[PDB]
Structures are given as structure tokens and as C-alpha cells.
Amino acid sequence: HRYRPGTVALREIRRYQKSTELLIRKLPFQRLVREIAQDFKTDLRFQSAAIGALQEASEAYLVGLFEDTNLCAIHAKRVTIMPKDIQLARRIRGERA
Amino acid sequence: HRYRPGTVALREIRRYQKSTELLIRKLPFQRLVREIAQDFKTDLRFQSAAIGALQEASEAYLVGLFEDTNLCAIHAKRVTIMPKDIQLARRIRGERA
Amino acid sequence: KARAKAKTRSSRAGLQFPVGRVHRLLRKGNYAERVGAGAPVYLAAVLEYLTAEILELAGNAARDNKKTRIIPRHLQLAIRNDEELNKLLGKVTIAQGGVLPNIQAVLLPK
Amino acid sequence: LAGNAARDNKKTRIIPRHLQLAIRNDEELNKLLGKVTIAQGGVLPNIQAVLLPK
Amino acid sequence: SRKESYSVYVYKVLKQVHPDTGISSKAMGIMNSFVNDIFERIAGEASRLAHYNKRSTITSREIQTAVRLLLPGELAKHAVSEGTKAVTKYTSSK
Amino acid sequence: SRKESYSVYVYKVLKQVHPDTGISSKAMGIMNSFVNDIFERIAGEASRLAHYNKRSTITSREIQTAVRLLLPGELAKHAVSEGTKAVTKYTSSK
Amino acid sequence: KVLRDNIQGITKPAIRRLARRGGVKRISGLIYEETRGVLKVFLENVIRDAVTYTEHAKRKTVTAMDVVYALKRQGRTLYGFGG
Amino acid sequence: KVLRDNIQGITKPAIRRLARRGGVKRISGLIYEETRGVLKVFLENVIRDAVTYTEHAKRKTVTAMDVVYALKRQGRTLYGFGG
DNA sequence: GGGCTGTGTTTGTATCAAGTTACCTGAATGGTAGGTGGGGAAGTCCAAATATTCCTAGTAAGACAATTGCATTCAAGGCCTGGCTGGTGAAACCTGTTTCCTGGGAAG
Ligand SMILES: [Mg+2]
């Protein structure tokens, strides 16, 4: 009937750790590259295997970030991640100077 | 007269962040390498600039570890580091599999 | 005139990865100026042991989930199941894989 | 930058501590050598301002 | 034109330990690009082993040290002995 | 025998922006080994730029791209324009 | 061509779904303004390294091996697209 | 040559003094059995990579550039000793 | 006691790949001659490792004091979940254009 909080959530963890699908969709990630590329050189083309080389590398970083974020949230006797965790996750690896 | 706890401690932080001295002494670190080298090849010699290349690289790692340990101890509303911090410090960087 | 039977150097060493193709990828990659005759033999073997060891482990995960062909999820999951294969590819993303199933056993429901 | 830190601490010659401290004082010089240990340097003076005494 | 590859030489290894097994196209390219990457790690560490010992020569000794560096633990015990079989078999021939 | 170095060419730069400044022995070796490392990053990325575009030639264009990769942000704006002065001065001579 | 408000294209569930792949049960509402920041840092250190390859060969199309060469540079190798 | 009990050579103040360089005020008494463990992990991934260079040139002395080449391999560069 | 979502089993076809080959060229091999690089054996000298003591400094320890860390309780806020609406994303279709894409070619 009424699920408790943390039950539909844990169904999602075993769901998405099994599939191989695209989580960030294509066109709202393709247009993100058409903002950062405009600075360094206007009028560039992209092969769709290179955009997909980013959509499987940006999703390779956040999942590598959030799984190292959630270590901190558990570490502070919590089960909730917070933006003080990520900003201290990245300072340990040296991914932000 | 009687210092409070945290006063002689904070004198040490501004002391050792100023000097360039050796903290781990030479011979109780030189003999540490004569335990790990015995497995891979017995009867090896070491140049003293190579042992010192380790004494300034092992002290380059723990200080890089403890300064990233103390971020976690402050993060759990504490001022004390604990061995649950280091074992979660290293899991974030990927320095232990 | 004719000549003798051309026996390939991959069949003269008992390997499957070529040695003729590896030996022109050590003289057109500017790795060094001289490349020994035994070096692309020895390197095509190490390319052949490590190509088995993934596909040995990629065969099992295909079988354990009732599959004929190995899709990249199995390559994602054959890696990071083995310990020493993971420490080689510790920095490496495999495309279209997702991650291993993992919960930290604190988020379990109450 | 290694000349300035030698001057600000009243030194004629540049010892590696100054090279340690000229790096990681500048931001963009640090992002080049972010992985790099400099020998015989120690670290910058740093407290997280929570360990200050009470 | 011609794209050289290692795709053919996978079927000659896939049909050695799993003879009733196919492999998809997009999984070939991983085992294709696994090879080209693990090629130039071993070569590109044997290359930098040539400069460190002042020789212009990549021997078959230098590939052995550039496999005992990249492969950890138990792969470094097998892939060494899975090469020195394929050399001793090679040199006794010809 | 002979150990080539960049130690002499530091005093010809140290005495350009701080003419009343010495430098120690063990700090020379850092700026010595800073050079040899930042040499082979730029060369060893210009080298791998030769294979990626199928040329056997390291031009002075390829060193410019292998400095806009290794140097971040504001160093990549100066060290490009601090090279093209030293080339245009060089080529107008001779 | 200019299309703005597309750092806001990384929607609120699609960061939650990425959080679920990392093994995260409960999240805050202030990760969404942190993730979009850390993402655009990572794409301003790949596209900045990718375009200098594509400009160097005087190509107008940043091809598939270009991005892989950029990710080769940072030490995060991507298999499956070549290179 | 064998000399044991020298992971216990990293003494109790010399881990505290390393803790003070990191900016740490108060420590536990159970870091001492953690630090000696994390230290010997780091020296079983450098000496294992250093000796394979020294054996490769058939030298009996692990020289100064050898360790720097090992630290080059892991991605933790050490300046000041060459290399 | 009941329910929901995940899971499984069976069928058909489309698609993807497996198959075999045709050629044709690219490349892969065979036989050779040449030089060079490296490998090997040596030696004086070189750098490190040891045996020692000596002294000293900080290491180790025992005691004490006070803060912090922990565990509980309190209070509520924040977030998760779901019933709903709709705007866009994606998949399928069509193309002209643009760029490449080596490759060859001309001309200064
Ligand atoms: Mg004319």
C-alpha cells in the first residue's frame, strides 16, 4: 500500500546497478557541449561517437564522485549526502584546485 | 602554569608547519626498507640518496594523508581523527583496493 | 621460379595474435630504432594471455546469466570481479557497463 | 616567485623551502604541479580554523 | 582505406576456451581497444626503459620487465611464463 | 664523464628578474629536474601528436599545441606568446 | 550557435538516477547546484583539451578519437570508441 | 640480511609529529596501528616497482633515479633527486 | 493477510553476426649481405654498509586533569513518495550541404 521512505529508494539502487542504459539523455547533454565549445572555437562540428565519448565519460565521473560522496555521508553518521560532502570529496583527490 | 589541552598542541602545528626537518628518523626508517626489500630480492644495496628519496616520499604521503584525514574528523563534528577516518580517506582517493 | 612454403611466425610459436603485425608496430611507432626478432613474439604472447583472461572471465558471466554472446556488461562485470584484473584497469572506464551491484549495508530498510 | 619569498624572509640565496613555498602560493603554478612533491620542503602553514584554542 | 585491427585474432582466442560462444560487434571494439591500450602501455614502458639504460634496442628482455610493472600480482606470474613458452617454442624453430 | 644539465641556464634567468639573488645547490636540482620533466611532457606530447596526424615531423606548430595542453589557463596564454616572440625574432635573423 | 540554460538540462531526476548508481539512498536538495558545477568543470577540462587536437589537424569536426585522446591526457582512459 | 620489529621503528612521537604537520590537534591512540599498516602498503608498492628496474639493468644497487622512476609510475612525482 | 514489483518462461522476427569466399593488394615471408649495437669480460676506483661507542635527546611511561566524545533525548525540518499534468526528447524519415579525405594533380 504505502511504502516507507527508503523502500522505493532501495529498489532504485539494485535497479540501476544492473542496467547499462543512458541516464543523462542525449540532446540535453549534447547541447551542454555546445556551450563550452563556443568559447574555445566557434563553429565546430562533433561526431556522435565523440559526444557519446563524453556522455560515457561524464557519467563515468559523477558515479565515481557520488560513490565517493556517499562514503562521506555514511562517515558523518548520516545517510544523506550534502554539498559539503562533494566539496570535501574533491579536495581529497585533488580534482579541484 | 598549567596549559589547557589544545594549547601545547597548537604550538606544535605552527612549529612543524615552518621547519623543513626530518620527522621520521633515518635509521628507524632505513631498517624498514630492509624488511620489504628482503622479499623481492635478498642482498640488495641502497644508495643513501635513495633511502632519503623514500624518507621524503613516505613523509610526503602521510602528511598528504593526515591533512586529508583531518578534513573528515572536522566533518563529523569532531576534532579527533580516528582509524575509521583514514580507512575512509583512502577509499575516496582509490589508494587502496 | 617458386619458393618454399610460407610458414607464418604466429604458427611457428604456437600463438594466435600475429607477430608480423606487431613487428611493424614497433618500427612505425618510433619506440626505438632497432627491434629484435624475438620481441614481437614475446609481446604477442602477453597480448594473448591477457586476451584470454578477460574472455575466460567474460565467458563465465555470460553463462551465469544464460547468454550466448558476451555483451559489454559482462566485460564490465568480468573486470572488477577479479581483483588483480581490476588493479590493472583501476583508472579505466568501460563503455556501456554501469557498475557492480553494491549497497553499503547501512541503507538497508528499517 | 622564488626571489620574493627569499626576500620576504631576508635571504640572499633561494633554498628549496622557497621553491616549495613559491609553488602552492600561486594558483596556476600549483595546478601544473598538483601531483608533484618537491623534496625538502614541508607544506604551507595551514590550520582549518576549527582547532583554534578554547 | 585499411584500418588494421585485432578483431580477427580475438575469434582465434575466443574459439579456444569457449568454442560455442559468439561475441557482439560493440563488445569486439572493447577487446579491440583493450589490446591497443595494453599494447602501448607495455611498449611505452619498454620504450622508456630503453632511455633509462641508454640503449637503442628493445629486446625481449625489456618487454618482460614492462609486464612485471603493469600487471599486478598473479597476472605478473602467469603472463611472464605464458611468454617464455612462446619464445622458447619460437627460437627452437626456424 | 659529462652530465649535461640546465644549471648554467638558470643563472642566466635568475640574474634577469632578481639580479641580487643566489640559489642553493639542492634547489638548483629542482629547477634542473623541473626542466627535464617539463621538457619531456611537452616533447612527449608533441611526439604523440606526430603519430596522431601521421607525420614524421615535429614542427614548431606541434610544440605550440603541446603547450596549450599541459599548461592550464593563464600560463597557456603567456608561454604561447613568449615563444612566438622568440621565433619571429629568430627567423627574421640568420 | 548559442543555446543557453542547458547546464539546467541535467535534470533533477537524472542526477538522482546517477546518485542511485553510486549506491546512494538519501540525498539532499543542494547537490543539484553542486553537481552541475562539478560537471561543467569536467567538461571545461576535456573540451578544452579536445579542441586543441581538432584545431591542430585543422579539422572542423571533433571526432571520436579526439575525446579519447583528451581523456588519455588526464589519466582517465575510455575504451570502446577506439584509441 | 634480516632485521625484524622495524615496522615498530616508526615511533609514537614520530607519527604524532607527522600528524602535526598535517594540521591535526588531537589524535587517538589507535592511529599508531593504522599508520604503520598504511605505510607498509605504500612501501610494498614502491620497492616492488623499484627493484624491477634495478634487476632489469642487472644492477645490485637500487639507485636514486630508480625510486623516482617508481614514483613516476604511480603518479606521485618526486623532484630534487633527478629524473 | 495481501499486494506490488521484480522475474521468469516461451515465441517470432528482425537484426546482427556468423559464414564463406573472391580478389588483390597489402603485407607478410624467405634468403642474403652488411655493419653496428650490444653483450661480455676486466680492472681501479668508488660508495655503501657495518661494527662501535658515546652521548644525548626524545621516547616511553605513570599520573592527573579536563575536554571531548558519546549516547540519549528533544524538537522539527527536510526529504521522500506519489497522484498529475504536459513539454520535450527520441525515434523514424529525407536531404542538401558541408566537410573531409585521403588521394592525385597543377603551378609558383
Ligand atoms: Mg611567381
Numbering used by the authors:
A (entry chain A), B (entry chain E): 39 to 135
C (entry chain G): 9 to 118
D (entry chain C): 65 to 118
E (entry chain H), F (entry chain D): 29 to 122
G (entry chain B), H (entry chain F): 20 to 102
Paper lines:
Integration of the reverse-transcribed retroviral genome into a host-cell chromosome is catalysed by integrase (IN), an essential viral enzyme (reviewed in1). The nucleoprotein complex from the prototype foamy virus (PFV) contains only a tetramer of IN, making this well-characterised intasome an ideal model to study the basic mechanisms involved in retroviral integration.
We then used cryo-EM imaging and single-particle approaches to determine the structure of the resulting post-catalytic assembly to 3.9 Å resolution. According to the atomic model, at the integration site, DNA is lifted by 7 Å from the histone octamer and bent to allow access to the IN catalytic centre, in excellent agreement with the earlier observations based on the crystal structures of the PFV strand transfer complex and the lower-resolution intasome-NCP cryo-EM data. Intasome engages nucleosomal DNA non-symmetrically at two distinct sites: at the strand transfer site, as well as at the opposing gyre, which nestles in the cleft between one catalytic and one outer IN subunit. Near the integration site, the C-terminal alpha-helix of histone H2B makes direct contact with the C-terminal domain of one catalytically competent IN subunit, providing corroborating evidence for the previously reported role of PFV IN residues Pro135, Pro239 and Thr240 in engaging the C-terminus of H2B15. Concordantly, truncation of the first 12, but not 8 H2A residues lead to a reduction of intasome-NCP complex formation. Furthermore, Ala substitutions of either H2A at Lys-9 or Arg-11 affect complex stability, while a combination of the two substitutions fully abrogated stable complex formation under conditions of the pull-down assay.
